[PDB]
Design a binder for this molecule. Sequence first.
Ligand SMILES: [Mg+2]
Ligand SMILES: [Mg+2]
Length: 136
Amino acid sequence: SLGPQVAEGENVFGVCHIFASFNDTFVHVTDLSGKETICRVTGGMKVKADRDESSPYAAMLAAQDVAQRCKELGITALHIKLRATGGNRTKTPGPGAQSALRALARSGMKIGRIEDVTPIPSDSTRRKGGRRGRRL
RNA sequence: GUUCUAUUUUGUUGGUUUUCGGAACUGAGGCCAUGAUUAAGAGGGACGGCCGGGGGCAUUCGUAUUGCGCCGCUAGAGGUG
Ligand SMILES: [Mg+2]
Ligand SMILES: [Mg+2]
């Protein structure tokens, strides 16, 4: 729990997988390989009404909690891997993506490299919804 | 030339071949300014270099999706106004 015993001034790098859907948000800090996870907090465990799991406020609270104990385990800097639902479904990030990423910068964490890792297909299976679409 | 053959012809009876004519068949000729319009901003076909998610058969790659096996950490995740 004391982290790595390494000289001062360096930055131990981790990666946070920011998965921002339209109905909740994930903030998931792991080590460089991604094999070993460290902190995982969603907007759903920080808000009471599930209509607000994807709200930008819940993401900022979720990001603060992750970064708060991320210092505790020794990590000082992060690589950012933003992600939308993607796949066969939408490919734009949800509302909570910006607040969660902004909060990490303000929480004292150091930002490394930001990249989008949305799972886009070459071409996919048939998309949910009829031929006339989700009509309302 | 051959065959059949109208009929004229030998003072008048009779027999044969002519030729003269008619019709058909068959040789060697000479002669014609000797005889085939053009080549459709019609078409068909040939040939030459290309062109195209045209067609059929086989082959190859790509993420994504679903499922499964293992590893990590966790209490929610999904969905909706
Ligand atoms: Mg229906
Ligand atoms: Mg309408």
